[PDB]
Homo-oligomer: 92 residues x 2
């Protein structure tokens, strides 16, 4: 059963919004504080840069997207273990 593979103590909200030029913060909580996660934008892996800042605080895994523009208006997902959850970012 997929039950033995549960990895998310807290998943992403269904959707988030942000004003143009603003910053959005995505947060998920893992059961295992040592488990690694990967973030994706519309299916392509996101990596640390000036647009994307990643933080790891114990069980929390955070992704900040800076200077949000319409190019950032998209679906995003994060993987942990054999699971994944997604969200939609709406840029105003």
């Amino acid at each position: 059963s997929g039950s033995s593979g549960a990895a998310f103590a807290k998943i992403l909200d269904p959707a988030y919004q942000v004003d143009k030029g603003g910053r959005v913060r995505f947060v998920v909580e893992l059961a295992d504080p040592k488990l690694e996660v990967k973030w994706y934008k519309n299916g392509q892996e996101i990596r640390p840069s000036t647009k994307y800042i990643f933080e790891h605080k114990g069980c929390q895994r955070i992704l900040f997207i800076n200077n949000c523009q319409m190019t950032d208006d998209s679906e995003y997902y994060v993987t942990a273990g054999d699971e994944k959850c997604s969200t939609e970012l709406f840029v105003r």
Copy 2:
């Protein structure tokens, strides 16, 4: 912006569980009571059968999976408009 495409008033819960031989009920709520939805099991469209019963009550879109077995332990998603949400079903 994807904001003008929002179609889910209520999305699926992150995960559901069910006992072997039991029945599970998935429910989502659309903003538009006339909008059609499609359900998928691990990426393949689910159709009305004895295993799958679909109900439409105003804005609510429901899917019942009967006689759940380990074969039903899987990821599922539903689409509405240009959006989709997913969930995991754990069979005990």
